[PDB]
Amino acid sequence: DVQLVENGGGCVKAGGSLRLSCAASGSTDSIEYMTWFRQAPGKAREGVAALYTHTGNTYYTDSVKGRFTISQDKAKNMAYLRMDSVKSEDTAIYTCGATRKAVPVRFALDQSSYDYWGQGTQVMVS
Amino acid sequence: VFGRCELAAAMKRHGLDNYRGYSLGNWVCAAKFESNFNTQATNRNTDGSTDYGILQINSRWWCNDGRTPGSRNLCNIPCSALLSSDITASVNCAKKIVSDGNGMNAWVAWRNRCKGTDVQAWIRGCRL
């Protein structure tokens, strides 16, 4: 019984630093992975920055390599995704998925694997 | 129900010892808190996935039962072999799982109890 929420978003010109936040409720202990998925208009939902709550290892797709960083707080059961050097293609709706089971690394960015989702937060680049 | 010392000796024989930088105590504790030293133990999941073997390997991602939709079957072996009394296949695919990259953190019992504890005490007093 984990509900995912998202905070932040909005218009951020190129190069602007955007701080997206995500939180978990209910039985947050069972959560294993936290990932951000961008639902770009006209494109299928795809992962952006996968993460493992316990180890803390962060996995990122090629596009956002070296620009976006994701970290979480154990006490608050929240994960926030830093953004930097944004470009035109970054405009999309970002969804903070979560799972109650240990997914493999190769499937950490897979949307089907995750058993939880939250209301996506729109991100626009001026 | 295999003996605690006997189970530790079996794990040592199978080569699980000194794998991914974990001692025998971690594996013994994980087995004890996953199946209470009972390899025949079987558990289901809310999603419908099934767990077989002493280490309770999940069917969705690890073993190919054929009853779980979209199974990644990483073990590449039938879940029945894991359900078999012998722990050879369980040891092999546990090596594979701990080699995933996240270590023994994948197993819930290990994180809950065998993480940051005196796991080595499990193999104490066993003449191994």
Author numbering:
A (entry chain C): 1 to 126
B (entry chain D): 2 to 129
Show the paper's wording.
Here, we show that a generic and kinetically biased ‘Gembody’ (Gb) interface, previously discovered through trapping in crystallo, can also be trapped in solution by kinetically controlled side-chain-to-side-chain bond formation in a manner that leads to ready generation of complexes; these display ideally balanced interface flexibility and yet relative complex constraints, in turn allowing rapid cryo-EM structure determination, even of small targets. Ultimately, after a survey of in-solution covalent bond-forming methods exploring differing natural and unnatural amino acid residues, we found that Cu(II)-catalyzed oxidation at a pivotal C12 residue site (together with the presence of needed Gb ‘gem’ substitutions previously discovered through iterative X-ray-guided engineering) offered a route to direct and rapid, high-yielding formation of disulfide-linked homo Di-Gembody (homoDiGb) without side reactions (for example, off-site oxidation) to form a robust covalent interface. Furthermore, the success of DiGbs for high-resolution structural solution is enabled by their relatively small mass contribution to the imaged complex while increasing the maximum particle diameter for better particle alignment. In summary, our plug-and-play DiGb strategy improves cryo-EM resolvability and resolution of small proteins through constraint and increased particle size with a simple and robust workflow and can even enable simultaneous structure determination of two challenging targets in one dataset.
We, therefore, chose to probe even smaller targets. Strikingly, within weeks, using an essentially identical workflow to that used for RECQ5 and SPNS2, the homoDiGb method was applied to 43-kDa MBP and even very small 14-kDa hen egg white lysozyme, achieving reconstructions at 2.45 Å and 3.16 Å, respectively. Interestingly, for lysozyme, an archetype of X-ray structure determination that we solve here by cryo-EM single-particle analysis (SPA) for the first time, we found that C1 symmetry reconstruction followed by local refinement yielded better resolution than imposing C2 symmetry for the entire particle. This putative observation of nominal asymmetry for such extremely small proteins may offer strategic solutions for other very small targets as this field grows.
